[PDB]
Amino acid sequence: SPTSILDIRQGPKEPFRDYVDRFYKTLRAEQASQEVKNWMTETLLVQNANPDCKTILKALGPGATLEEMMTAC
């Protein structure tokens, strides 16, 4: 507040739905183009999830929807 999108990481006990909401709000607050925000989400969202969730999300493979990610965790 203001936090860089680079610093948003899922806590060890943080539910994935809470982390995605925190990530979304932080990125909304960032002063950047839609292109930069898209690149940031593609690069950081799964990468900055906690190791337990990251194993689950990566197993879904590329192109998984947010709905599918929510129903996996």
Binding site: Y24, K37, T41, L45, E67
Partner: peptide
């Protein structure tokens, strides 16, 4: 996931 996906998911 893109930022547009997040905008569409949350509204």
């Amino acid at each position: 996931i893109t930022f547009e996906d997040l905008l569409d998911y949350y509204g």
